[PDB]
Design a protein around this nucleic acid. Structure first.
Lengths: 234, 171, 191, 10, 165
RNA sequence: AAGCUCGUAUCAGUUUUAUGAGGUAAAGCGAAAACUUUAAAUAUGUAAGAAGUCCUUGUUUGAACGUGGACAUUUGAAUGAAGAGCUUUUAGUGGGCCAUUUUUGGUAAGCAGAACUGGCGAUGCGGGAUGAACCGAACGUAGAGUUAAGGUGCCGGAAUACACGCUCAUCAGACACCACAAAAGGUGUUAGUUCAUCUAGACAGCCGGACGGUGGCCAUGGAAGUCGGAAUCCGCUAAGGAGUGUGUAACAACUCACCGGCCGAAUGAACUA
RNA sequence: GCAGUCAAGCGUUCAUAGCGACAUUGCUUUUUGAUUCUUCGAUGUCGGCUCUUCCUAUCAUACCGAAGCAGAAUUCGGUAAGCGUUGGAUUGUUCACCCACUAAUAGGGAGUGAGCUGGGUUUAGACCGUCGUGAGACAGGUUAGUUUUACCCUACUGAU
């Protein structure tokens, strides 16, 4: 566009793009993990809290979780059998569809899947998921938790977020002088319905975390067997 | 009228102690051989200390296109000495012959840059031997397979001052 | 660069029908029908398989491509209005004097009416546009829900409604009273 | 963007 | 400044953390025509002889002027154009200070103008330099130094000058 | 003008040959392009033969004075021409405006002081709608014909010709515009130069992460990243900043720099015209 | 205005050969609204009575945005000339300011030097003070002093 083009943002944050060199570094690191560790895994985790990911990383000192862009991990595993870093290694790359989540480990293959079956943590609604539970906002004054907990311990919502309640959340909030209030007990979501993204934003602003989370796994490479296996659990 | 390509040659008036001075050659585009020799002397004066009095035209001949009927893309080196100092330029042209391509290039330069023929220089011209060597989109759009475009505004001429038919734009 | 041609697809819902002979356009659907005068825009519609239409602009400039893109946008808007419709909403609020908005059938035009705005004795009137149907929101205090097949009519009606009540000679920061848009969702809701 | 930049070098 | 920050005097301790050929600077100056610099004042019921001239430019009349009686008054140097001070600037240290004028030493272009005290963008003038703290070797503290005016007095009321170090 | 002592082979607002003449240097190899050799354009004087040239020798030998003898016409370079200058003595005029160069001095800006080349004065005619200067142009009376500047939509004689590109201006433009406002500003358009990313996913678009010592060290009814000062690391990451902004008394929360999730391919920045 | 500093750019080494936009430092009479009871040679006339017309660089009226605009009142900015923009004192002078009303008493061109008018282009009288031996004017001031349309033509307002 020679003219009348949209202006670019000029924000002056200290951070800068890592560039292709970071991708090459992750590629070399994945190759080192492939040539060092025997077993390999392709975890699927579309979203995870950063502290939860750190807690998963600290669960064992004997293993490493080289996260990266799915294309980078695929090229490290070989996009095709001719490009595979190791025999039959290309098959492990084919199974991945989601975020990964590669988990090289020297630990016994059974213990890893057992720990994954045991691990579980609370998580947000993660839209396109069925509603964990049905609830309705109190017809009286709104509170920071949304009334999920008894009002005597709850505190009124800060006024500063009220306009977002009218614009983003679509709730017909009325900002009464002293506190925000709604004339009627608006329902956040019915049980089992596919959540709208605005409904998930409302549940996040209210702090509800009824949904559970547990990383799934689809397959694990075995360098000793030189072949992928399709064991899976959720 | 139409531009005519020409080649020029010289040897700087051979003198004693320098038998057979080295020949030089430069393709030139001009309406006539006189202008071609003038541009050749003007180029030799810039690339060498020699002068028209110091040399002579060893030969002059027109260069007809080997395949004038054939369509050909033609990239062309260009530089114009205005308004600021001279700088390199490049343009693609789809023309049936190199001379018509040079004429369309001179017209596009005089239009989009107001450059005069005295300022324009043609450092090089070459055909695009193969597809996808083209870069700018305006030539690429004509390369599409089975391309077809209309001419909706066919404004027919009317020699008569009056027209009882109320002519249509058809098409 | 005087592109050799440009075009944009126009998806046709199976229940929609949109005859086009002249540049004037017409559309029909379960919710009704609509029409528009596009003769000025100089564009050529082209049906392919009755499920799509490809407007085209040969040898056009960048401004002509922008005209073609807005033509496709107006066509998609007319299709969404004849299929889904539109259901505008506008909350109103007051500080000390309650608002008394009410519909009236003066002169047969179904004039909108407002009273006691900020205590003013003037009775402002905002005539309803053709097609759009005013209706107060059910079980929702101090609200009105405009709706109409065309975005243009309902949008101009909401604009005139918010403009007729504009405050004057008073600081806006203290006087929050005045009608304001609340939502611009489709009549379906949820389909 | 000249197609034959390499040819001039030789 | 953001790109620079992202990539990243020898004074006494009492003085730190504080803040503020012999060619003349202007050997050449525009020649002032005699047709100007002398307004033709006219006087009497019949303005024929007019017997008078008046300077149209600033002049250092001196402390002891004591205006001449009007009957003998041919030349005139009106008080509004007079100045008792000049904005001399010292090239050393970058300092500039307003100081009283003392005397007009050498006016080029018919130094009879120097007898008239005219400055006219280049005339040298003595100035009281004692405020600058200058002290010549031997302990005889200086209190005067030459200075050359630069700005034209006619175009502004200030009388700037560069100190002759 | 009286004319007359000439039809005398003599002259020119010209070019060239030779010698200067100011020296930007770009070549050099010679002594060590480094220094002297060289050499280009920006405008300059002198000489270019017919009674013209050469040879011989008497003098205080260098030199010039003189006598005598020889060489005939491509006989002295190119182009043009019948014009030698004085003697007699006569009408009018002696600063008067303007265009480029060239050198001396100049400054808010104009410019001032000298030479030469040109128009007017004394000048018509065609065009710039007219004009002291602009362009064309050799003024007897007419016919035919061919042209310049300048034009070819009408006034206005001549194509609302051809072929290629830019222009929507809420008084553009046909303007002296290679001149003071003139330096840039316009998310108004078109064409180019340079620097970067990319199917191990280019820009934009929608969703999540944006972590822990930590509520870092100094002010204290209170600053937790964001009312006040000096640093701004480690730990793990794909990444995450003692924090780019919104907002609370603080918190909280929202959001962005950068990453990850989804479609997909060309995309972004600085300059020139 | 004078002296100085960084450089977005320019320019054969290269900004440090030279310049240089936008910024910036030191002075021009006191940091405690203290002072400022300074007002300093216009050699030349400008200023006023009736009255028409034009411009915006808009005081007010009309419509809007912003400003700690809660109100009132007020400031700036955008459009806007359609209509308004006053009655007087001061001549030991008036290139001026005051009070009072009004929404406001904004700035300019043709001005009207044969429409009339004071200051003035003021010749002939005189006096005071200066110069010059004198004649006279002059660094001054005062006083009193005849430039008198059209029926010609045209423009405009009426009328055959």
């Amino acid at each position: 566009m020679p003219r009348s083009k949209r202006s670019k943002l000029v924000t002056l944050a200290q951070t800068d793009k890592k560039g292709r060199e970071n991708k090459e570094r992750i590629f070399d690191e994945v190759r080192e993990a492939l040539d060092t560790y025997r077993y390999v895994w392709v975890l699927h985790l579309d979203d995870v809290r950063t502290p939860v990911l750190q807690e998963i990383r600290t669960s064992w000192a004997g293993s490493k979780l080289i996260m990266g862009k799915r294309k980078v991990l695929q090229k490290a595993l070989g996009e095709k059998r001719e490009e595979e870093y190791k025999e039959n290694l290309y098959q492990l790359s084919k199974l991945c569809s989601g975020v990964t989540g590669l988990l090289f480990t020297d630990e016994d293959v059974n213990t890893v899947k057992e720990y994954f079956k045991s691990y579980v943590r609370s998580d947000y609604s993660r839209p396109n998921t069925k509603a964990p539970l049905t609830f309705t906002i109190p017809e009286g004054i709104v509170y920071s938790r949304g009334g999920q907990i008894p009002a005597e311990e709850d505190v009124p919502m800060i006024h500063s977020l009220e306009p977002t309640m009218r614009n983003k959340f679509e709730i017909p909030t009325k900002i009464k002088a002293g506190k925000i209030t709604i004339d009627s007990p608006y329902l956040v979501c019915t049980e089992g319905e596919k959540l709208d993204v605005r409904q998930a934003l409302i549940l996040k602003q209210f702090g509800i975390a009824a949904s559970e989370f547990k990383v799934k796994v689809s397959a694990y490479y075995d360098n000793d067997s030189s072949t992928v296996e399709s064991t899976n659990i959720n | 009228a139409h531009f005519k390509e020409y080649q020029v040659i010289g040897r700087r008036l051979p003198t004693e102690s320098v038998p057979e001075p080295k020949l030089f050659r430069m393709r030139i585009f001009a309406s006539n051989e006189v202008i071609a020799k003038s541009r050749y002397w003007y180029f030799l004066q810039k690339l060498h200390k020699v002068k028209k009095a110091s040399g002579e035209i060893v030969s002059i001949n027109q260069i007809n296109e080997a395949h004038p009927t054939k369509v050909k893309n033609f990239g062309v080196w260009v530089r114009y000495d205005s308004r600021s100092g001279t700088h390199n330029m490049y343009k693609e042209i789809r023309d049936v012959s190199r001379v018509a391509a040079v004429e369309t290039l001179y017209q596009d330069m005089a239009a989009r840059h107001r450059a005069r023929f005295r300022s324009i220089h043609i450092l090089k011209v070459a055909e695009i031997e193969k597809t996808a060597d083209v870069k700018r989109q305006y030539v690429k759009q004509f390369l599409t397979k089975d391309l077809k475009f209309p001419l909706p505004h066919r404004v027919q001429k009317s020699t008569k001052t009056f027209s009882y038919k109320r002519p249509s734009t058809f098409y | 660069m005087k592109y050799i041609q440009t075009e944009q697809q126009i998806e046709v819902p199976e229940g929609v029908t949109v005859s086009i002979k002249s540049r004037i356009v017409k559309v029909v659907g379960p919710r009704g029908t609509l029409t528009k005068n596009l003769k000025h825009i100089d564009v050529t519609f082209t049906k392919v398989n009755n499920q799509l239409i490809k407007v085209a602009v040969h040898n056009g400039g960048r401004k002509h491509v922008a005209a073609l893109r807005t033509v496709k946008s107006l066509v998609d808007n007319m299709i969404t209005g004849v299929t889904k419709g539109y259901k505008y909403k506008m909350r109103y609020v007051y500080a000390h004097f309650p608002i008394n908005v009410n519909i009236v059938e003066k002169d047969g035009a179904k004039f909108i009416e407002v009273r006691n705005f900020l205590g003013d004795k003037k009775i402002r009137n905002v005539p309803v546009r053709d097609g759009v149907t005013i209706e107060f929101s059910t079980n929702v205090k101090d609200e009105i829900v405009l709706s109409g097949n065309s975005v243009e009519d309902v949008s101009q009606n909401a604009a005139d409604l918010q403009q007729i009540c504009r405050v004057r000679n008073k600081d806006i920061r203290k006087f929050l009273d005045g009608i304001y848009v609340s939502h611009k969702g489709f009549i379906t809701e949820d389909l | 963007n000249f197609p034959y930049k390499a040819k001039i070098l030789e | 400044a953001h790109e620079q920050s992202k990539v990243k005097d020898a004074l006494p301790t009492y003085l730190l953390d504080r803040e503020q050929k012999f060619s003349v600077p202007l050997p050449k100056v525009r020649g002032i025509s005699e047709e100007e610099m002398f307004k033709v004042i006219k006087t009497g019921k019949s303005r024929s002889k007019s017997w008078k001239r008046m300077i149209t430019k600033h002049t250092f009349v001196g402390e002891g002027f004591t205006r001449r009686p009007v009957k003998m008054e041919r030349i005139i140097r009106p008080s509004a154009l007079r100045q008792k001070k000049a904005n001399v600037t010292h090239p050393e240290l970058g300092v500039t200070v307003f100081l009283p004028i003392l005397a007009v030493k050498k006016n080029p272009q018919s130094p009879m103008y120097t007898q008239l005290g005219v400055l006219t963008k280049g005339t040298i003038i003595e100035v009281n330099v004692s405020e600058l703290g200058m002290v010549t070797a031997g302990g005889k503290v200086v209190w005067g130094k030459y200075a050359q005016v630069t700005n034209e007095p006619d175009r502004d009321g200030c009388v700037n000058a560069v100190l002759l170090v």
